[PDB]
Amino acid sequence: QATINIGTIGHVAHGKSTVVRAISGVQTVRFKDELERNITIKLGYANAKIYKCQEEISPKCQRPGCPGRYKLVRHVSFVDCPGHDILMSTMLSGAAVMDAALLLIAGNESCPQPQTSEHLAAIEIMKLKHVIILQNKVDLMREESALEHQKSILKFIRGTIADGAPIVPISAQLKYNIDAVNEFIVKTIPVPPRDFMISPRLIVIRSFDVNKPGAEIEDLKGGVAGGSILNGVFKLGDEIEIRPGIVTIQCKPIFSNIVSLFAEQNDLKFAVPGGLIGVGTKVDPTLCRADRLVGQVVGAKGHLPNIYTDIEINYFLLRRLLGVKKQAKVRKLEPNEVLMVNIGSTATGARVVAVKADMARLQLTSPACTEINEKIALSRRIEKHWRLIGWATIKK
Amino acid sequence: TSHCRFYENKYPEIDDIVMVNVQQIAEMGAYVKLLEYDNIEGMILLSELSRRRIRSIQKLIRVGKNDVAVVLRVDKEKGYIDLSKRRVSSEDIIKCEEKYQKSKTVHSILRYCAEKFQIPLEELYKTIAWPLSRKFGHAYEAFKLSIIDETVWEGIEPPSKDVLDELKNYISVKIRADVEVSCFSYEGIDAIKDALKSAEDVKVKLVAAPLYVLTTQALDKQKGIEQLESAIEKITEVITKYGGVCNIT
């Protein structure tokens, strides 16, 4: 199945979807009539092939001269998030689901673009320094201007946790120069190991009913959860608890036996981790209605994640903020103020109980589940929409 | 072409219960017309109306509208025949008018079979009358027989065959429900299936996982009052035993 969760990052109206299309052919759709013209809310999904010519996009070597057929390397799946500074929660969720990143910078649009920088920062925070950098709108720029842009980018990427991350000049519309990108996908991104015995944990980003308009109820379908595994091969025929729960104010975890564990385009026996998977469960498709299973944790039955509202956070912050042009000073965190705490996939609205030296105690208005220590990206409301302040770990 | 004879006599022979409507009264009584032979007309005298001298303000309310009567006397060649509605029992309202209503509904079928087929009405009427309304009672109860007793369609020749098709098209209502299955469970699918397996066996359509459009057929329009309600009750029953939540519009 899908071997490595590779994410796509860039500015809004630059062409992440376009890039995906160029790579795979699989469309992110762009939907709900708002997003048909403009920008997606959900993650965009695509399945790209790597079968190398060693003597590729398709498993045949008729194209690159030598008739010695395309030698199977990998199959990779995309994690394409919204690159808008309003919808950052989704991006954050994607980030602690990904194994590696793909940057997208346009030629004619500037080098210190705010959103892109923010994305980069997020990636750095959440252990995602494996970034393949792509020059995108180069089918517009001069023989000198492009070079200048590249130089500027290089200059920028000197103090960042990205040091010598590779840059490729592609056209997402004209279909050129993606060979290099493909090569890098095997070269610069090795897949981090993901075993059998590391306790099975599924991180849900999407809720899906496949209940088509027109059918009869004597021919029914269950609930499908679109979520990623980063530990534990889920096999067909297992019982599950989804632990952030269902709301009564108290919450109670949801129990579902596996109908299917579906990856690629064809349903499989297994779901080997480091991939984003559509899990058919006996759970109602009415709870998989639109975007209900977003930021929920799934464990195999006989397991104890903990649903915390009162949290011990170890926090770290910036000197100067991101999301804006206008990079504003980080004023100190203020008590009993609504922050957004992004933990793996959750985007919970939290109130500050205490501020110490490097630790903070937080109240959650919506309960999140901590199994391990859990990776956090933090966010705040200063300029209406949510800006990225810093990062944390749950000290548990 | 519009209307014609019923039973092959020019006049409603002595002592047969008929129906008329009163058109106007000036001094004689009403200038009625015999509703079985519509274009022909008889009349009634004032003492053969209601016995209490009917006032002119009592007189005006009854014109145009119809009632039931019997015929006193018949001119063999004049149309000027004497009516009787005063000396008529109340059972003839049940007897004649429903029999006439059973002959009003064959006027509804023999109009588009005649003029929308562009033939005069009496010729495809008088192919029907003698083997149907003289062999036994008149043919509308036999028209609910001839849809299953096809010795009548072959018992007479069809001069046209459009009329054989236009009969069973005519002689042979949805209550919308947007029930909202707002479930949050694990055994909900089964419940839904169970619900389907009793409410559909009337027209049930899936819209999504929560919304369902079911258009329950009613016969008297008020007989689907006992159907929709029943369905609702079933729905209520269903979801308490499985784990989810169903809400009804």
Task: Kindly state whether residue B7 falls inside one of the protein's structural domains.
Answer: no
CB A85 within 8 A of CB A91: no
Contact indicator for A333, A341 with CB cutoff of 8 Å: no
Tell which of A256, A259, A284 to mutate to test the B interface (max B CBs under 10 Å). Answer: A284
- For position B156, which CATH number holds? 1.10.150.190
The answer to whether residues A138 and A275 belong to one domain is no
Within 13 Å of residue B195, how many CA atoms lie on the same side as its CB?
A: 31
A275 and A396 in a common domain: no
Instruction: Write out the E strands in A24-81.
Output: 47-52, 71-80
Quick one: B142 and B184 in the same domain?
no
Which residues lie below 8 Å from residue A65, measured CB to CB, with a gap of 6+? none
- B204, B206, B244 ranked by CB distance to A211: nearest: B206
Give the Cβ contact number of residue A334 at 10 Å.
Answer: 10
Strands A167-169 and A131-135: parallel
Domain final residue, candidates A304, A321, A356: A304
Residue with tokens 């933990």: A343
d(CA A391, CA A357): 14
Bridge partners, residue A387, by sequence = A380
Domain that holds residue A201: 195-304
d(CA A293, CA A203): 10
Method: cryo-EM
Cα B69 to Cα A117, B14, B53, B59: the distances in Å are: 98, 12, 19, 18
B197 interfacial to chain A (CB closer than 8 Å): yes
Residues ending a continuous segment of chain B before a break (C–N > 2.5 Å):
172, 201
Number of domains forming the structure of chain B: 3
Q: Hey, of B179, B182, B186, which one would you mutate to test binding to chain A, going by the most A CBs within 10 A of its CB?
A: B186
Contact B204 A217 (CB under 8 A): yes
Q: Please choose, from the candidates A31, A9, A27, A7, the residue with its C-alpha nearest in 3D space to the C-alpha of residue A17.
A: A27
Distance (Å) of CA B66 to CA A127, A369, B23, B112:
93, 82, 9, 25
Query: Does A289 contact B209 at a Cβ distance shorter than 8 Å?
Result: yes
Q: Is there a domain that residue B9 lies in?
A: no
List, in order, residues 6 or more apart from A127 with CB less than 8 Å away: A375
Angstroms from B195 CA to nearest CA on chain A: 9
Whether A282 and B207 lie within 8 Å, measured CB to CB: no
Is B185 in the same domain as B159?
no
User: Does A373 belong to an annotated binding site?
Assistant: no
**Mutation site, A259, A286, A289, interface B, largest B CB count within 10 A:** A286
Q: At CB < 8 A and 24+ separation, what contacts does B119-125 make?
A: B119/B160, B120/B1, B121/B1, B121/B2, B121/B3, B121/B4, B122/B1, B122/B4, B122/B5, B123/B159, B124/B159, B124/B160, B124/B163, B125/B4, B125/B5
Q: In whole angstroms, what is the distance from residue A370 CA to residue A299 CA? A: 12
CA distances to A70, A212, A213, A375, A394 from A293, rounded to whole Å, are 39, 19, 21, 20, 23
What are the strands, taking DSSP E only, across B53-173? 66-73, 82-84
Rounded distance between C-alpha atoms, residue A203 and residue A295, angstroms: 7
For chain B, count helices (H), then strands (E). Answer: 9, 7
Do A144 and A40 share a structural domain? yes
Cα A3 from Cα A192, distance rounded (Å)? 10
Give me A147's structure tokens.
Answer: 């070079």
Judge if A63 and A168 occupy the same domain.
Answer: yes
Total Cβ atoms within 10 A of residue A115: 21
B180 and B164 share a domain?
Answer: no
Residues of chain B contacting A213 with CB distance shorter than 8 Å? 206-208
Which of A194, A215, A248 is a domain's end point?
A194
Chain A, chain B: beta-carbon pairs less than 8 Å apart: 70
Bridging pattern class, strands B203-206 and B174-180: unpaired
Say if residue B108 is in the same domain as residue B131.
yes
Q: Identify which of A273, A259, A285, A260 has the alpha carbon closest to the alpha carbon of residue A202.
A: A273
Which residues have CB under 8 Å from A292's CB, separation 6+? A207
Q: State phi, psi for B68 to the nearest 5 degrees.
A: -115, 150
The rounded distance, in Å, linking the Cα atoms of B69 and A294 is 80
Judge whether A240 and A299 are in contact, CB under 8 Å: yes
Are A52 and A171 in the same domain? yes
The answer to whether residues B147 and B179 belong to one domain is no
Q: What is residue A298's DSSP assignment?
A: E
Say how many C-beta atoms besides its own lie within 10 A of residue B30's C-beta: 24
> CA B216, B218, B220 angle in degrees (round to 5)?
165
Same domain (yes/no): A49, A176: yes
Residue B116 lies in a domain: yes
Is A286's CB within 8 Å of B204's CB?
A: no
Contacts of B237 (CB under 8 A, 6+ apart): none
What is the CATH number for B85? 2.40.50.140
Beta bridge partners of A270: A235
Number of domains in chain A: 3
Measure the CA–CA gap between B204 and B221, rounded to whole angstroms.
Answer: 18
Q: Which of A194, A219, A250 is the last residue of a domain?
A: A194
Residues 6+ apart with CB under 8 A from A117: A322
Q: Which helix (H) or strand (E) holds B104?
A: helix B98-112
**Is B82 exposed, middle or buried (CB count within 10 Å of its CB: 0-12, 13-18, 19+)?**
middle
A214 to chain B, minimum CA–CA distance in Å?
A: 6
Asked if B42 is an interface residue toward chain A (Cβ–Cβ < 8 A), one would say no
Phi, then psi, of B163 in degrees rounded to 5: -70, -30
Q: How many Å apart are CA A28 and CA A9, to the nearest integer?
A: 14
Nearest chain A Cα to B194, which residue? A218
Which ranges of A96-238 would DSSP assign to H, the alpha helix? 114-125, 145-156, 178-187
Distance CA B81, CA B42 (A): 5
A171 is in an annotated binding site: yes
For residue A231, the distance in angstroms to the closest alpha carbon of chain B comes to: 25
Answer yes or no: is A211 a known binding residue.
no
Q: After which residues is the backbone of chain A broken at C–N > 2.5 Å?
A: 55, 248, 325
Q: What is the DSSP letter of B54?
A: P
Long-range contact set of residues A138-144: C-beta below 8 Å, sequence gap at least 24: A138/A107, A138/A169, A138/A170, A138/A171, A139/A107, A139/A171, A139/A173, A139/A174, A140/A107, A140/A108, A141/A107, A141/A108
Strand, helix or coil for residue B11: coil
Q: Chain A contact for B191, CB < 8 A? A: no
Q: Which residues pair with B34 in a beta bridge?
A: B20
CATH number at residue A219: 2.40.30.10
Residues of B in contact with A217 (CB under 8 A): 192-193, 195-196, 200, 204, 206, 212
Domain match, A213 and A114 both: no
Q: Kindly identify which residue of chain B lies nearest to residue A293, measuring between CA atoms.
A: B184
Interface of A with B in 220-239 (CB under 8 A): 220-222
The two three-digit tokens of residue A365, written as one number? 């208005």
CATH of the domain at A158: 3.40.50.300
- Within 8 A of A220 by CB-CB distance, chain B residues are 189, 192-193
Residues forming a β-bridge with A347: A342
- Residue B192 structure tokens: 């839904």
Phi, psi of B175 (to 5 degrees): -110, 110
Q: Resolution in A, one decimal?
A: 4.6
Nearest-5° angle of CA B157, CA B162, CA B164? 55
Same domain, A33 and A53: yes
Helical pair A178-187 and A16-23, crossing angle rounded to 10 deg:
80
Range(s) of the domain holding residue B197: 173-248
Q: Return the closest-CA partner of residue B195 out of B186, B207, B206, B184.
A: B206
Q: Are residues B109 and B156 in the same domain?
A: yes
Query: Who's near B188: CB < 8 A, 6+ residues apart?
Result: A284, A286, B181, B239, B242, B243, B244
Partner residue opposite A217 with nearest CB, options B183, B185, B193 = B193
Same domain, A12 and A152: yes
Is the Cβ–Cβ distance between B231 and B203 less than 8 Å? no
Beta bridge partners, A342, equal A347, A377
Q: Tokens 């784990």 label which residue?
A: B243
Q: Is residue B123 within a helix (H) or strand (E), and if so which, with residue range? A: helix B121-125
Q: Are residues A42 and A150 in the same domain?
A: yes
Q: Does A249 share its domain with A339?
A: no
Looking at residue A212, the DSSP 8-state letter turns out to be -
Find out whether A221 is annotated in a ligand binding site.
no
Examine the domain organization and report whether A209 and A139 are in the same domain: no
Q: Which residue in B187, B195, B209 is closest to A285 by CB distance?
A: B209
Considering B56, B91, B126, which residue would you say is the last residue of a domain? B91
In angstroms, the first-to-last Cα distance of chain B is 52
